[model samples]
Target: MTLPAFKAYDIRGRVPDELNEDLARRIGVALAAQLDQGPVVLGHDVRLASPALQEALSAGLRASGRDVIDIGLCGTEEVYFQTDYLKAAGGVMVTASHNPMDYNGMKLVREQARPISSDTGLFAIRDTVAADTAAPGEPTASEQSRTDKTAYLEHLLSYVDRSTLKPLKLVVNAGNGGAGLIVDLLAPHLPFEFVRVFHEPDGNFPNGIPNPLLPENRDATAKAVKDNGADFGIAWDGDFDRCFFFDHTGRFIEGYYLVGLLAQAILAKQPGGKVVHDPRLTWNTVEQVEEAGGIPVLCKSGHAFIKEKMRSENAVYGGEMSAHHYFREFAYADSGMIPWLLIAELVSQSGRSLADLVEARMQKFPCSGEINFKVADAKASVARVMEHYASLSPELDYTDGISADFGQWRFNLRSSNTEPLLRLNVETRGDAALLETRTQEISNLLRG
Candidate 1:
């Protein structure tokens, strides 16, 4: 009665065995039943099996007399954008994102691009799929192709003043995913020179898994930036929803700092707006948002949680240390395209290098980028950490996970919602030595 692909937030699993065309079709049928009365938008990443899955999904939807809008071979955010922009009932993106080649997944949303997570309506759809026994029905509705990116591109460009943009050289590493296509489309309208690396949309992913989070996978983009003497570098996963950044020096900027940087950039345009952020890396984002004259609202770290909170608070922007950036104008959906453009504008307007922009903040709040430990007992490891620091009586908060503040320094320890790992993040107020020592101390405790 349960599906392996049905996760808390999205549907993701190994192909054939876990998530095949049949399941995708069933999901489509169930999704059509769950949404409001309107056509559904469908899109896919550059995976070999994606189009087929999307076809299966379309077949199922049309079988139920639901109209389908197929936006072929595109990024996830595009699906969200088109869904809201077209005033469709819902949208589904067939993508595994940074998952391995053997895996694939789907991200779903309803009208206005609102997420359909487990608590929302994902589980009900799963149950309907589980109970589904009827034969595949014949198509009673129609499927139309709407691949135009004009409106989406215009919305993206609207975030910045084109007249103020400088002609900075930027390195864009698509990592064989769908991001390059968007970059190429936006290039003619922008004033930046692009140094494309692994820019082709190759499902084979010959270079790597398209995840810049991996130190080994980042060299291509970093080297491209350094070699080209580019102003900065940007990279994205398969679906290109989350983006990563590298400075002109080829240094990978911690995504935590980016939350603050982006908050500042957005607040400059929408002053006194609310900004939602995750609890993992708080100090810098809070300081930056407050300094920018914006109210910082903390939310649990995840796209669904952040989006919901953003809507509730009418937040102008929401960011996570994980490189997910959401905008109010973009229906509160995270976009891999928007962040880079904002930062490009920030760098150009401030006449400062990307490195120079974040250098002081990085020092002021040195942090250990998220350290993951695949522990046999996540709860016990967390207990060990809490117990070890019990004597210190740190200020405790559980906005997302266990965050203990020790005045000058703090750390957060939480188990991954989707993986068998515990993620730890430690930060200090201008004390690199303390940050390093505490991070190691917590690392040892968790490993123990």
Candidate 2:
């Protein structure tokens, strides 16, 4: 069978056709040989096809002389936590992460939860899997067993101090994903009250895809917050690696604003520490980092690059505009759980609502979150936008993506990593009308 689904970061594709148990088994053998170690932690989410594929993959791992510790039904972050805690040779999580129900994939990490990307031996593994050589020997069934569910819960709770958090009503929408298990496990120990919605694990995802970035998928969570008179609402993706938030007014706060808020919270504790942020959205983060007496370093967009930069600079915290927050204390692995804990801590300490913190940042950085458009020629479209603004702008940069500043409105135009589209992020100092007008101007230019 041909394997054409391998990508730079992970193996992702539509199920049954592009990905299946056979493919997973071969990939598992390739990973074991590539890493050359044993006792790898294996985890899967609530996807319908996950169990069969996970079992086949485990067979291949043990067949290749590697012991496997199975962590049944977990999020990607929990898999990272298990691998780090177990001190295993590597970890493999069978999850597509916010993709449609028909799609399933795997995320691989080396020892200490370090990611395995294209430059970091994923290419070799892909090549080996594609070769389809002889099958390795299947070891005894004793190699696969359930991981410590209680230990995972304890590890998650250790990140927050429950005593310091204030009592507030919260609406948590698991979106019929894998987060419900951990949420249920932790709710009893917390000081705050939580009303759960769509918390049941359903592989069909009847409510819709779990991606909160889509406006349609956010309604249930927003409605829960409004109907229940709760303080705020939180939603997670399918595998629960990233999180999104809505205010008491049921207003969806942009992930970029959350980045600034979390950065401030981390910087307050480690004053003058280095903070890392993605290049897509940087103004407000730079401002917050500086105001909090922390140095800000801009890096490429993606977890692998950000984590490497974090370790190199010894940065205390890092965040992306896409809601992926990384903490050095968490083995430099991004977690959807840490952001809410930090937000709760911020709210408790300041006694301010989510709207207050978000609106304050909105006033300073009036932004059009991110607008995407299909383009025949992404490079040419970006060039056109650049040419139109370069003559009027005082500064232009292309460190990760094309960014231009005009003292009134600044926008970043970049191409998507996995799609044939151009993404534009526009922001201004305090002019909402100007932000909209400039965003429209760039949209029109790129569309033409």
Candidate 3:
């Protein structure tokens, strides 16, 4: 049988069944063969099984004559950061991302922290691991532990002007995940005060799995922002590669506006630099980038596509509506830690509240914010929606999905890469009522 854990972009599945120490070791060997001859950076999240899997992977890497630079427990982005920072051949991050407990995965990258998608090398590695039948070999290369966060913390702090930051109160909800690790490391270097919620790195996930996208999981950070009367709030996933924000009013900020705000911010620092954005949502991002004296480049969604686009275009920044913020300086990888710091700096320097900053943009391009549905037949449902709207003479874009534009309103309907679900986004030009009406309309259509 084929390996079920290996997917389009990464290796993820149920721990013991689809993934195990033995498979991890084989993957390590496969990965060692896939990358260049140099040390590999290894990191893992706050999962109970992560350490053991990483150990097995390390053993396999070592057995294959590849040195392993163990960064110990960390977020997924750290693998990307350190891979480039250390100039390693590749890096691997053990995480389940926002997946449920009992599921774990690994995100792999080659030199310069470029992703290793199926076409790149992941499927080859999967095929190799599946075909190999020999017993595990003894370690040949050395393994070194590098727990020092001095370089990483310093790197994260360099994104924003520390002097421009105010001692504003901010809520940081780690969601009982790995982000707390970096936040504490960043605490001593910054001037702002942080109210930490779900700060403990408990693998059991007592508060719940660290997915802020769920409406129920969002309230902790929101309530904290209002209760403390803090300037704003931030939350992260299990691996903490993606970050989410909350306003001073305890309202969760849609990632769509953040993309525009961040593009504008980065363009201010690097004037006329190109900014890459996913095609899922565009109006706000395009307007902001152009107004900020920068070119906006729309690319397909997903980290691999976004990263490659950013690298090729030399985009200073790339943002997705899903809260993945990529920076050219950080080896052109997405970061959950760098964003809030920049936001803090922006708030302090502009003397504007987070809500004040994003409120106008939110109103101008009100969006459905990516409603998801588990459809039995996504293609048929999409066809029905298209058929229903065919009479409107809307402009069609197949950038990442089927984005139908009807002057005042637009919607992008597509399949979710990570799950068997249909994802939809609807937006209107400064018409909140229209946004709601069409959003419900499309949602009902999808469900039906």
CA lDDT scores, all candidates in order: 0.93, 0.86, 0.92
Candidate 1: tens digits of C-alpha lDDT, residues 178-273: 999999999999999999999999999899888998888788889999999999999998899989999999999899999999999999999999
- lDDT for each residue of candidate 2 in 1-448, tens digit (9 for 90 to 100): 4366777788898989999988889988888887746588899988899988898889888878888999888999988988888898899999978898789999999898999998898888888888877856667535767766787677667766778888888899888888878788888888888989988989988888788888888888898899999989899998999999999999988899988899888887788999999877789999999999999999988879999999999999999999999988888899888788788878888899999999999998988988889999888898788777766854777877777878877888789876779988989988999998889888999999
Q: Residue 432 lDDT in model 3?
A: 95
TM-score of each: 0.98, 0.96, 0.97
| Per-model root-mean-square deviation over C-alphas | 1.2, 1.7, 1.4
Q: Clashes in model 3: which pairs?
A: none
Clashes in candidate 2: how many?
Answer: 0
Best model per TM-score: 1
Report residue 14 deviation for candidate 3 (angstroms): 1.0
Model 2's lDDT to the true fold?
A: 0.86
Better of 2 and 3 by lDDT: 3
In model 2, which range of ten residues has the least summed lDDT?
135-144
Clashing residue pairs, backbone N/CA/C < 3 A, model 2? none
Ordered by TM-score, highest first, the candidates read 1, 3, 2
User: Mind giving the per-residue lDDT tens digits that candidate 3 earns over 1-448?
Assistant: 6788999999999989999999999999999999987999999999999999999999999999999999999999899999999999999999999999999999999999999998899999999999989899999999999988888898888878888889999999999999998898888889989999999999999999999988888998898899999999999998998999999999999899999899877887999999999988899999999999999998999889999999899999999998999999999998999888889988999999999989989889998888889988878888889988999999999988899999999998888765668889888999999998888888888889
